[PDB]
Every structure is written in C-alpha cells, then in structure tokens.
C-alpha cells in the first residue's frame with residue numbers, strides 16, 4: 001500500500017531495460033520526440049502528452065512514481081502516442097507493437113510479485 005521509491009525502482013527497471021535493449025525496435029523511443037529534427041513538425045498537434053523511455057527512466061530514478069501502475073501508465077502512454085501518430089503500415093508503429101509485446105511478457109509477473 002506504500003511503495004518506497006528504491007523498491008519500485010529495483011522491481012521495475014528490468015522491465016524498462018527489456019524495452020531499451022530491443023535494437024532496432026527501441027531506437028525511435030529512447031529520447032523525447034523532436035518534431036522539427038525528425039521532420040514530423042505536426043507531432044504536438046496530435047500528441048498532447050509525449051512520453052519516451054529516457055523520461056520514464058528519469059522518473060524511476062527520481063522517485064516520481066508513488067505506485068507501480070503509474071509506471072505502467074507511462075509506458076502505455078508512450079505506446080498509445082506512437083499508435084495514434086503513425087500510420088499502421090509505418091515501421092515506427094510496428095516497432096511500437098513489438099515493444100508492447102515484450103512489455104506485456106516482462107511486466108505481468110513483476111506486477112504480480114508486487
């Protein structure tokens with residue numbers, strides 16, 4: 001009912017590492033979206049709450065999650081952002097789907113041990 005930041009961190013970091021380590025599939029997700037650099041300048045018109053892996057890492061590192069479902073919500077926000085923004089035929093969309101499949105596998109037994 002009260003989760004200490006260092007125990008969320010130690011429980012959840014390996015699930016975040018599972019996403020990061022997927023190469024090339026994590027590469028679009030490792031840093032905040034820079035719409036001008038990426039040549040997707042309308043991104044913030046579509047995606048109102050951006051999220052990426054390095055953001056989620058920083059949140060886990062600084063104790064910003066009071067409970068583990070908040071971490072799951074940020075991961076899924078990142079995925080929902082990609083599935084909204086990109087066409088279903090896009091390699092970014094398909095990479096997002098692969099990362100969600102990996103996440104589902106890794107997070108389910110972790111959320112159960114919590």
Ligand SMILES: C[C@H]1Nc2c(cccc2C(=O)NCC(F)(F)CN2CCCc3ccccc32)NC1=O
Nearest residue numbers: 009010011012013014015016017018020021053057
């Ligand atoms: C996964 C394994 N390690 C940790 C685990 C818990 C806490 C920290 C680490 C660790 O390793 N922290 C240093 C770092 F620097 F790795 C940050 N690191 C973590 C993965 C996400 C990521 C992405 C890019 C760069 C670093 C990084 N549990 C473990 O099971």
Ligand SMILES: C[C@H]1Nc2c(cccc2C(=O)NCC(F)(F)CN2CCCc3ccccc32)NC1=O
Nearest residue numbers: 024027028029033038040081082085086091092095
């Ligand atoms: C989250 C945001 N990302 C992009 C989106 C559209 C276009 C580009 C990106 C993006 O991030 N580019 C940086 C990259 F590092 F990913 C480059 N590169 C590495 C190898 C693997 C690969 C695969 C597909 C596209 C690029 C890419 N749509 C999005 O929603």
